[PDB]
Amino acid sequence: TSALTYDAVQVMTEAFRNLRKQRIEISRRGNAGDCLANPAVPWGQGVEI
Amino acid sequence: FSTSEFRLTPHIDNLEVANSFAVTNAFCSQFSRGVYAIFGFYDKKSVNTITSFCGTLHVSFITPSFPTDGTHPFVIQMRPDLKGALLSLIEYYQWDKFAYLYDSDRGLSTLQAVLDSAAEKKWQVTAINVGNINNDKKDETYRSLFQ
Amino acid sequence: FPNTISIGGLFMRNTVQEHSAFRFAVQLYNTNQNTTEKPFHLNYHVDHLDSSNSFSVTNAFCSQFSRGVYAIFGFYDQMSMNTLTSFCGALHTSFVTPSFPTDADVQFVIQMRPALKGAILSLLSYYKWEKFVYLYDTERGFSVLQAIMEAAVQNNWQVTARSVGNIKDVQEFRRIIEEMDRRQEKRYLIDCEVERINTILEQVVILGKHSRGYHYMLANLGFTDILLERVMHGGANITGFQIVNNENPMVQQFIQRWVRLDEREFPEAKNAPLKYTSALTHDAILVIAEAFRYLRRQRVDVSAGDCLANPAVPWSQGIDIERALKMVQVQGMTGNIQFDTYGRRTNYTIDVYEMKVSGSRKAGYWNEYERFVPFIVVTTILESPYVMYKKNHEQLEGNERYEGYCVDLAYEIAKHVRIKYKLSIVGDGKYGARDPETKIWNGMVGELVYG
Ligand SMILES: *[C@@H]1O[C@H](CO)[C@@H](O[C@@H]2O[C@H](CO)[C@@H](O[C@@H]3O[C@H](CO)[C@@H](O)[C@H](O)[C@@H]3O)[C@H](O)[C@H]2NC(C)=O)[C@H](O)[C@H]1NC(C)=O
Ligand SMILES: *[C@@H]1O[C@H](CO)[C@@H](O[C@@H]2O[C@H](CO)[C@@H](O[C@@H]3O[C@H](CO)[C@@H](O)[C@H](O)[C@@H]3O)[C@H](O)[C@H]2NC(C)=O)[C@H](O)[C@H]1NC(C)=O
Numbered sequence: 001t002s003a004l005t006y007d008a009v010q011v012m013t014e015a016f017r018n019l020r021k022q023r024i025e026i027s028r029r030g031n032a033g034d035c036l037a038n039p040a041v042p043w044g045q046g047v048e049i
Numbered sequence: 050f051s052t053s054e055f056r057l058t059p060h061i062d063n064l065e066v067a068n069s070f071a072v073t074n075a076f077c078s079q080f081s082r083g084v085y086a087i088f089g090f091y092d093k094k095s096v097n098t099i100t101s102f103c104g105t106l107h108v109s110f111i112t113p114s115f116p117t118d119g120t121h122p123f124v125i126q127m128r129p130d131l132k133g134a135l136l137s138l139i140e141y142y143q144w145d146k147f148a149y150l151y152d153s154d155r156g157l158s159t160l161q162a163v164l165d166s167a168a169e170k171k172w173q174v175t176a177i178n179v180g181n182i183n184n185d186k187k188d189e190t191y192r193s194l195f196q
Numbered sequence: 197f198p199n200t201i202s203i204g205g206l207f208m209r210n211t212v213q214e215h216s217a218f219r220f221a222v223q224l225y226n227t228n229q230n231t232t233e234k235p236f237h238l239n240y241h242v243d244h245l246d247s248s249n250s251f252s253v254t255n256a257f258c259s260q261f262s263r264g265v266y267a268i269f270g271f272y273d274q275m276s277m278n279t280l281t282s283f284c285g286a287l288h289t290s291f292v293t294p295s296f297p298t299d300a301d302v303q304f305v306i307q308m309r310p311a312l313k314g315a316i317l318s319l320l321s322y323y324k325w326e327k328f329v330y331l332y333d334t335e336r337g338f339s340v341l342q343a344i345m346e347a348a349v350q351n352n353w354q355v356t357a358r359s360v361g362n363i364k365d366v367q368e369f370r371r372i373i374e375e376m377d378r379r380q381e382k383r384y385l386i387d388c389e390v391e392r393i394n395t396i397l398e399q400v401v402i403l404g405k406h407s408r409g410y411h412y413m414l415a416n417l418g419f420t421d422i423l424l425e426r427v428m429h430g431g432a433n434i435t436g437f438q439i440v441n442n443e444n445p446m447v448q449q450f451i452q453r454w455v456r457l458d459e460r461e462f463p464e465a466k467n468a469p470l471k472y473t474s475a476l477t478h479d480a481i482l483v484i485a486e487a488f489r490y491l492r493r494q495r496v497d498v499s500a501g502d503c504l505a506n507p508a509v510p511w512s513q514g515i516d517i518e519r520a521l522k523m524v525q526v527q528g529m530t531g532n533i534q535f536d537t538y539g540r541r542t543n544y545t546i547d548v549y550e551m552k553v554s555g556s557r558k559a560g561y562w563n564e565y566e567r568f569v570p571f572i573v574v575t576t577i578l579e580s581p582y583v584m585y586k587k588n589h590e591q592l593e594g595n596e597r598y599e600g601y602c603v604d605l606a607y608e609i610a611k612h613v614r615i616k617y618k619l620s621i622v623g624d625g626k627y628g629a630r631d632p633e634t635k636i637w638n639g640m641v642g643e644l645v646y647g
């Protein structure tokens with residue numbers, strides 16, 4: 001499990017570097033809202049992630 | 050794995066994993082911070098909470114835990130399948146009657162897989178759960194088990 | 197003391213008749229016209245669950261908690277089991293349910309549907325089965341599967357199991373039945389849903405030649421809803437399970453009060469038989485009524501906020517309400533109703549019906565304390581001078597067509613016994629043999645072995 005954690009950190013770093021190399025700006029702030037929003041509308045830029 | 054183009058910021062939450070209420074609290078605390086991805090574990094019983102709250106809100110979840118039974122969106126997993134390798138090992142060893150001491154804390158997918166392939170290959174599985182035995186009297190129960 | 201008791205209703209898909217029985221039980225409780233058994237007024241709020249996911253269940257539970265209730269009657273599946281048990285054990289909210297019993301031992305969960313594995317293992321020990329087939333899904337718990345596995349370990353049984361919960365094509369069911377025919381299996385135990393049991397029985401009827409000489413133990417409480425009419429016309433017997441006794445006069449009074457309802461205010465009430473889940477709903481309403489009457493008689497207090505507060509700080513009175521839901525001893529539609537310290541059923545009775553070729557009967561009842569308490573072809577071959585046909589053999593009928601040594605021998609055996617017989621002829625013309633490959637006896641030997 002520790003080795004899979006060490007590999008998953010590399011996977012997340014490579015994916016965020018691919019976002020940084022594809023010039024895709026998804027930057028926002030800490031205003032995602034309540035987790036129990038009704039209806040909780042999604043944000044589309046996670047679908048690319 | 051620190052880079053030059055950016056910098057990650059992990060929000061570490063050391064809570065329980067079997068109680069889904071604390072999992073929901075930690076998930077909503079991470080969601081109130083406005084995060085893009087969540088790394089974490091999940092228990093065998095609290096897999097549905099993780100898959101529901103990560104497929105509905107479309108937030109990706111990377112995990113080293115056991116593989117699920119089904120295709121849930123936004124669930125990236127690090128542990129590969131164990132059932133196919135185990136069936137390949139038995140078919141390489143050419144078995145027909147064996148015992149299977151399993152634990153009930155990572156689901157029962159491997160048990161269903163080995164029972165289906167054992168009945169398809171005409172085998173004799175003596176499958177016994179061991180997870181329901183407490184830590185206080187786990188010496189005479191194991192003696193009766195191996196008897 | 198309220199004088200205002202509002203409860204919550206969690207209804208998933210396929211909960212129409214259960215919602216109607218819930219509303220009708222609330223209507224029966226509110227229209228008692230007596231100051232003793234009706235000491236207050238009962239209110240309720242209904243949230244219909246669209247999906248089985250934990251997100252909608254969590255939203256409905258937080259809506260019921262922010263509304264302010266004292267008890268929540270609801271349903272759950274595999275996808276919403278741990279969510280409801282965790283949110284109801286963390287916030288100390290008592291949760292009543294007629295759904296499948298959970299595997300683990302938890303708190304604040306009052307289960308109306310009793311456990312089934314004790315009666316199943318008792319009927320397995322009574323029928324002396326040691327080699328059988330076990331079809332199962334996952335949608336009603338894993339306690340029955342683990343019980344069957346443990347009993348096969350202890351009693352040295354041969355269980356051929358199939359997880360059929362993910363199968364949608366009926367050709368897989370057909371090849372599983374053909375494979376069990378190739379293993380010469382005659383005994384089946386199906387722990388599945390009602391629609392899946394109906395699908396498997398339709399595949400038995402359409403595939404055919406799977407009725408006479410077979411026994412299908414249907415380990416499910418929806419025995420009134422299983423379409424088994426075409427199975428009964430082939431010669432198969434079925435061991436079923438019911439917890440709703442029609443000889444109970446409270447049940448038939450509920451039927452007489454149930455069939456006179458309108459379709460507009462109570463759908464699925466006249467055009468469908470009464471499911472066991474609706475009777476469990478009515479018995480749950482009776483248990484909740486007895487619990488709040490006991491809370492009023494003992495002067496115990498029952499008297500908002502966020503469901504995700506950090507920390508939670510639950511209101512401590514509901515544990516006593518949990519105690520009030522763990523000491524109810526009543527007589528409802530399923531008979532005696534009590535509860536243990538985990539909210540499981542005890543002191544109850546499961547009715548077992550056998551439907552053989554002679555017809556249907558109540559073969560006995562099950563109790564967890566004591567036990568399940570229950571309550572001529574003659575063949576030959578044409579050989580001279582043993583069996584020969586007559587000259588004008590077409591001019592007669594019956595056993596008089598044949599003649600010879602063994603015919604007179606059979607007549608003397610019937611004279612010294614006094615039982616009527618029937619002279620039959622073996623079709624394949626073989627005497628008796630066993631192939632080394634198929635291990636199947638043929639001829640008259642195969643006629644005697646295979647019945
Ligand atoms: C209202 O509903 C109940 C339905 O039974 C009735 O209240 C009952 O009142 C009796 C009076 O003592 C309670 O004791 C019973 O007495 C009878 C006759 O002595 C006895 O045979 C019983 O074994 C019992 O001791 C009884 O517990 C009580 N029932 C309940 C459920 O509380 C009452 O008749 C109804 N009508 C009115 C106008 O109150
Ligand atoms: C119906 O289900 C039962 C299992 O519940 C099947 O098993 C048993 O089959 C035998 C053969 O007819 C019957 O019992 C036997 O009775 C004789 C005396 O006549 C006795 O010497 C034997 O030891 C045996 O008990 C009976 O049908 C049944 N046994 C009991 C206790 O019910 C049966 O085969 C199934 N029927 C069909 C058509 O598949």
Ligand SMILES: *[C@@H]1O[C@H](CO)[C@@H](O[C@@H]2O[C@H](CO)[C@@H](O[C@@H]3O[C@H](CO)[C@@H](O)[C@H](O)[C@@H]3O)[C@H](O)[C@H]2NC(C)=O)[C@H](O)[C@H]1NC(C)=O
Pocket residue numbers: 525532534543544563565566
């Ligand atoms: C626990 O389960 C047992 C089944 O093993 C059941 O016990 C039965 O409870 C009823 C209700 O009280 C008893 O009926 C009454 O018994 C008294 C004698 O104490 C008698 O005077 C009454 O006229 C009435 O018949 C019954 O005897 C008793 N036992 C059996 C074998 O049926 C019941 O389901 C649970 N017991 C309790 C106390 O809830």
